[PDB]
Amino acid sequence: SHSMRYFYTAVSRPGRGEPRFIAVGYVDDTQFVRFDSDAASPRGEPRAPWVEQEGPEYWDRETQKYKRQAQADRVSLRNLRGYYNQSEAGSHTLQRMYGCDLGPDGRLLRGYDQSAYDGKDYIALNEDLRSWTAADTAAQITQRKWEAAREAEQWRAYLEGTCVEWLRRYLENGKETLQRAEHPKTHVTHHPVSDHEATLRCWALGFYPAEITLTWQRDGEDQTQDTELVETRPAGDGTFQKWAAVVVPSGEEQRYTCHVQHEGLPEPLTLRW
Protein backbone atom coordinates (compact mmCIF):
# COMPACT_ATOMS: atom_id res chain seq x y z
CA SER A 1 0.00 0.00 0.00
CA HIS A 2 0.99 3.61 -0.65
CA SER A 3 -0.52 7.02 -0.06
CA MET A 4 -0.20 10.59 -1.19
CA ARG A 5 -1.01 13.26 1.39
CA TYR A 6 -1.17 17.05 1.33
CA PHE A 7 -1.11 19.25 4.44
CA TYR A 8 -2.21 22.90 4.25
CA THR A 9 -1.85 25.36 7.13
CA ALA A 10 -3.17 28.93 7.03
CA VAL A 11 -2.57 31.21 10.01
CA SER A 12 -3.88 34.73 10.55
CA ARG A 13 -1.66 37.29 12.31
CA PRO A 14 -3.67 40.38 13.26
CA GLY A 15 -1.53 43.49 13.29
CA ARG A 16 1.42 41.65 11.73
CA GLY A 17 0.16 41.38 8.16
CA GLU A 18 -2.05 39.07 6.12
CA PRO A 19 -2.44 35.32 6.80
CA ARG A 20 0.46 32.98 6.03
CA PHE A 21 -0.21 29.84 3.97
CA ILE A 22 2.10 26.79 3.95
CA ALA A 23 1.58 23.59 1.95
CA VAL A 24 3.57 20.35 1.94
CA GLY A 25 3.00 17.14 0.00
CA TYR A 26 4.11 13.60 0.80
CA VAL A 27 4.21 10.23 -0.88
CA ASP A 28 4.27 7.66 1.95
CA ASP A 29 6.80 9.10 4.45
CA THR A 30 8.72 11.16 1.84
CA GLN A 31 8.01 14.86 1.35
CA PHE A 32 8.13 16.00 -2.28
CA VAL A 33 6.78 19.56 -2.42
CA ARG A 34 6.51 22.75 -0.38
CA PHE A 35 4.99 26.20 -0.76
CA ASP A 36 5.28 29.21 1.59
CA SER A 37 3.17 32.29 0.89
CA ASP A 38 5.59 34.51 2.84
CA ALA A 39 8.38 33.89 0.32
CA ALA A 40 9.02 36.77 -2.05
CA SER A 41 7.36 35.67 -5.32
CA PRO A 42 6.46 32.27 -3.82
CA ARG A 43 6.68 29.07 -5.86
CA GLY A 44 5.86 25.43 -5.45
CA GLU A 45 9.28 23.89 -4.86
CA PRO A 46 10.55 20.32 -5.20
CA ARG A 47 11.70 18.47 -2.09
CA ALA A 48 12.35 15.02 -3.60
CA PRO A 49 14.49 14.18 -6.65
CA TRP A 50 11.72 12.33 -8.45
CA VAL A 51 9.67 15.47 -9.12
CA GLU A 52 12.64 17.61 -10.17
CA GLN A 53 12.26 16.44 -13.77
CA GLU A 54 8.55 17.24 -14.08
CA GLY A 55 9.24 20.45 -16.00
CA PRO A 56 8.28 24.12 -15.81
CA GLU A 57 4.66 23.79 -16.94
CA TYR A 58 4.00 21.36 -14.08
CA TRP A 59 5.73 23.61 -11.57
CA ASP A 60 3.96 26.70 -12.90
CA ARG A 61 0.69 24.80 -12.56
CA GLU A 62 1.34 23.71 -8.97
CA THR A 63 2.48 27.24 -8.10
CA GLN A 64 -0.72 28.66 -9.58
CA LYS A 65 -2.82 26.27 -7.50
CA TYR A 66 -1.00 27.17 -4.26
CA LYS A 67 -1.24 30.93 -4.86
CA ARG A 68 -4.98 30.67 -5.42
CA GLN A 69 -5.36 28.54 -2.29
CA ALA A 70 -3.32 31.03 -0.24
CA GLN A 71 -5.45 33.98 -1.34
CA ALA A 72 -8.67 32.03 -0.80
CA ASP A 73 -7.66 30.93 2.70
CA ARG A 74 -7.50 34.61 3.63
CA VAL A 75 -11.18 34.85 2.65
CA SER A 76 -12.03 31.62 4.48
CA LEU A 77 -10.33 32.78 7.69
CA ARG A 78 -12.31 36.01 7.53
CA ASN A 79 -15.56 34.09 6.96
CA LEU A 80 -14.87 31.79 9.91
CA ARG A 81 -14.17 34.66 12.26
CA GLY A 82 -17.57 36.01 11.23
CA TYR A 83 -19.40 32.70 11.67
CA TYR A 84 -18.11 32.43 15.24
CA ASN A 85 -18.22 36.17 16.14
CA GLN A 86 -14.54 36.00 17.06
CA SER A 87 -12.47 39.10 17.75
CA GLU A 88 -10.28 40.39 14.94
CA ALA A 89 -7.54 40.74 17.55
CA GLY A 90 -6.92 36.97 17.95
CA SER A 91 -4.93 34.75 15.60
CA HIS A 92 -6.63 31.66 14.12
CA THR A 93 -5.50 28.60 12.16
CA LEU A 94 -7.17 26.71 9.30
CA GLN A 95 -5.77 23.31 8.36
CA ARG A 96 -6.61 20.82 5.61
CA MET A 97 -5.34 17.30 5.05
CA TYR A 98 -6.30 15.46 1.86
CA GLY A 99 -5.07 12.62 -0.29
CA CYS A 100 -5.55 9.02 -1.30
CA ASP A 101 -4.63 5.54 -0.03
CA LEU A 102 -3.90 2.75 -2.51
CA GLY A 103 -4.05 -1.01 -2.11
CA PRO A 104 -1.46 -3.46 -3.41
CA ASP A 105 -3.16 -3.49 -6.84
CA GLY A 106 -3.04 0.30 -7.10
CA ARG A 107 -6.79 0.67 -6.54
CA LEU A 108 -8.13 3.45 -4.32
CA LEU A 109 -8.82 2.23 -0.79
CA ARG A 110 -9.90 5.58 0.64
CA GLY A 111 -9.78 9.28 -0.25
CA TYR A 112 -9.69 12.09 2.30
CA ASP A 113 -10.44 15.80 2.52
CA GLN A 114 -10.64 17.01 6.14
CA SER A 115 -10.43 20.53 7.56
CA ALA A 116 -9.73 21.84 11.05
CA TYR A 117 -10.17 25.25 12.65
CA ASP A 118 -8.61 26.38 15.95
CA GLY A 119 -6.94 22.95 16.23
CA LYS A 120 -10.06 20.78 16.00
CA ASP A 121 -12.30 19.14 13.39
CA TYR A 122 -14.30 21.63 11.35
CA ILE A 123 -15.64 19.78 8.30
CA ALA A 124 -14.74 16.52 6.61
CA LEU A 125 -15.56 14.84 3.33
CA ASN A 126 -17.16 11.52 4.22
CA GLU A 127 -15.75 8.15 3.06
CA ASP A 128 -18.30 7.99 0.25
CA LEU A 129 -16.73 11.15 -1.25
CA ARG A 130 -20.27 12.45 -1.70
CA SER A 131 -21.34 13.98 1.63
CA TRP A 132 -19.95 16.01 4.52
CA THR A 133 -19.67 15.82 8.30
CA ALA A 134 -19.82 19.26 9.95
CA ALA A 135 -18.44 19.53 13.47
CA ASP A 136 -20.70 22.40 14.59
CA THR A 137 -23.34 24.86 13.40
CA ALA A 138 -20.71 27.16 11.89
CA ALA A 139 -19.36 24.29 9.80
CA GLN A 140 -22.97 23.64 8.76
CA ILE A 141 -22.89 27.02 6.97
CA THR A 142 -19.87 25.81 5.00
CA GLN A 143 -21.60 22.48 4.35
CA ARG A 144 -24.69 24.10 2.82
CA LYS A 145 -22.46 26.30 0.66
CA TRP A 146 -20.42 23.30 -0.48
CA GLU A 147 -23.53 21.19 -1.10
CA ALA A 148 -25.09 23.91 -3.25
CA ALA A 149 -21.86 24.22 -5.24
CA ARG A 150 -21.26 20.46 -5.71
CA GLU A 151 -17.88 20.70 -3.99
CA ALA A 152 -17.94 16.97 -3.17
CA GLU A 153 -18.17 16.02 -6.85
CA GLN A 154 -15.05 18.06 -7.59
CA TRP A 155 -13.10 16.41 -4.77
CA ARG A 156 -14.29 12.92 -5.72
CA ALA A 157 -13.13 13.46 -9.31
CA TYR A 158 -9.71 14.45 -7.98
CA LEU A 159 -9.47 11.76 -5.30
CA GLU A 160 -10.55 8.86 -7.54
CA GLY A 161 -8.65 10.07 -10.62
CA THR A 162 -5.85 12.65 -10.44
CA CYS A 163 -4.72 11.65 -6.94
CA VAL A 164 -4.53 7.96 -7.80
CA GLU A 165 -2.90 8.49 -11.21
CA TRP A 166 -0.22 10.91 -10.08
CA LEU A 167 0.59 8.89 -6.95
CA ARG A 168 1.22 5.89 -9.21
CA ARG A 169 3.38 8.04 -11.49
CA TYR A 170 5.47 9.36 -8.58
CA LEU A 171 5.89 5.80 -7.28
CA GLU A 172 7.27 4.68 -10.64
CA ASN A 173 9.54 7.72 -11.12
CA GLY A 174 10.94 7.42 -7.60
CA LYS A 175 10.84 3.63 -7.21
CA GLU A 176 14.57 3.35 -6.43
CA THR A 177 13.95 5.20 -3.16
CA LEU A 178 10.20 5.06 -2.50
CA GLN A 179 9.78 1.30 -3.01
CA ARG A 180 12.95 0.23 -1.15
CA ALA A 181 13.11 -0.35 2.60
CA GLU A 182 16.15 0.69 4.67
CA HIS A 183 16.76 -1.68 7.58
CA PRO A 184 17.28 -0.23 11.09
CA LYS A 185 20.73 -0.09 12.68
CA THR A 186 20.25 -1.21 16.28
CA HIS A 187 21.97 -1.11 19.68
CA VAL A 188 21.15 -1.17 23.39
CA THR A 189 22.23 1.40 25.97
CA HIS A 190 22.27 0.97 29.75
CA HIS A 191 21.93 3.54 32.56
CA PRO A 192 21.62 2.95 36.32
CA VAL A 193 18.74 5.01 37.70
CA SER A 194 19.16 4.30 41.42
CA ASP A 195 21.14 1.96 43.66
CA HIS A 196 18.78 -0.83 42.60
CA GLU A 197 17.40 -0.17 39.09
CA ALA A 198 18.72 0.40 35.57
CA THR A 199 17.33 1.64 32.26
CA LEU A 200 17.74 -0.53 29.17
CA ARG A 201 17.08 1.37 25.95
CA CYS A 202 16.79 -0.29 22.56
CA TRP A 203 17.71 1.96 19.62
CA ALA A 204 16.64 1.72 15.97
CA LEU A 205 18.29 4.21 13.60
CA GLY A 206 18.36 4.99 9.91
CA PHE A 207 15.30 3.06 8.75
CA TYR A 208 12.67 3.70 6.07
CA PRO A 209 9.64 3.60 5.99
CA ALA A 210 8.75 4.94 9.43
CA GLU A 211 6.66 1.91 10.45
CA ILE A 212 8.59 -0.22 12.95
CA THR A 213 7.95 -2.39 16.02
CA LEU A 214 10.33 -2.33 19.01
CA THR A 215 9.52 -4.63 21.93
CA TRP A 216 11.14 -5.79 25.17
CA GLN A 217 10.80 -9.24 26.73
CA ARG A 218 11.74 -10.61 30.14
CA ASP A 219 12.75 -14.28 29.77
CA GLY A 220 10.65 -14.39 26.61
CA GLU A 221 7.52 -12.76 28.08
CA ASP A 222 6.31 -9.54 26.46
CA GLN A 223 6.66 -6.44 28.66
CA THR A 224 4.10 -4.30 26.86
CA GLN A 225 2.84 -2.19 29.76
CA ASP A 226 6.33 -1.59 31.20
CA THR A 227 7.92 -0.47 27.92
CA GLU A 228 8.31 3.26 27.30
CA LEU A 229 8.16 4.12 23.59
CA VAL A 230 9.12 7.41 21.98
CA GLU A 231 7.29 8.47 18.83
CA THR A 232 9.23 7.73 15.67
CA ARG A 233 11.25 10.84 14.77
CA PRO A 234 13.04 12.01 11.60
CA ALA A 235 16.80 11.68 11.33
CA GLY A 236 16.90 14.62 8.90
CA ASP A 237 18.14 12.61 5.90
CA GLY A 238 14.80 11.02 5.04
CA THR A 239 15.21 8.07 7.44
CA PHE A 240 13.79 7.61 10.93
CA GLN A 241 14.73 6.76 14.52
CA LYS A 242 12.93 5.23 17.47
CA TRP A 243 13.79 3.89 20.89
CA ALA A 244 12.05 1.70 23.46
CA ALA A 245 13.11 1.54 27.10
CA VAL A 246 12.43 -0.58 30.17
CA VAL A 247 13.44 -0.05 33.81
CA VAL A 248 14.70 -3.28 35.38
CA PRO A 249 16.11 -4.38 38.76
CA SER A 250 19.89 -4.13 38.89
CA GLY A 251 21.38 -7.56 38.30
CA GLU A 252 18.42 -8.76 36.25
CA GLU A 253 19.42 -7.06 32.97
CA GLN A 254 20.43 -10.43 31.52
CA ARG A 255 16.80 -11.59 31.38
CA TYR A 256 15.76 -8.86 28.94
CA THR A 257 15.85 -8.93 25.16
CA CYS A 258 14.87 -6.29 22.61
CA HIS A 259 13.07 -7.35 19.43
CA VAL A 260 12.95 -5.30 16.23
CA GLN A 261 10.49 -5.75 13.36
CA HIS A 262 10.77 -3.73 10.15
CA GLU A 263 9.99 -4.21 6.46
CA GLY A 264 13.74 -4.07 5.82
CA LEU A 265 14.36 -7.04 8.12
CA PRO A 266 13.39 -10.43 6.64
CA GLU A 267 13.67 -11.97 10.13
CA PRO A 268 13.06 -10.07 13.41
CA LEU A 269 16.25 -9.04 15.20
CA THR A 270 16.98 -9.86 18.84
CA LEU A 271 19.32 -7.76 20.99
CA ARG A 272 20.50 -8.24 24.57
CA TRP A 273 22.58 -6.09 26.88
Binding site: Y6, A72, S76, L80, L94, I123
Partner: peptide, 9 residues
Protein backbone atom coordinates in the same frame (compact mmCIF):
# COMPACT_ATOMS: atom_id res chain seq x y z
CA UNK B 1 -0.23 16.84 -7.85
CA UNK B 2 -2.38 19.21 -5.80
CA UNK B 3 -6.15 19.65 -5.83
CA UNK B 4 -7.06 22.17 -8.57
CA UNK B 5 -10.39 23.34 -7.21
CA UNK B 6 -11.13 26.22 -4.93
CA UNK B 7 -14.08 27.14 -2.73
CA UNK B 8 -14.35 29.34 0.34
CA UNK B 9 -15.52 27.93 3.65
Amino acid sequence: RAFPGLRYV
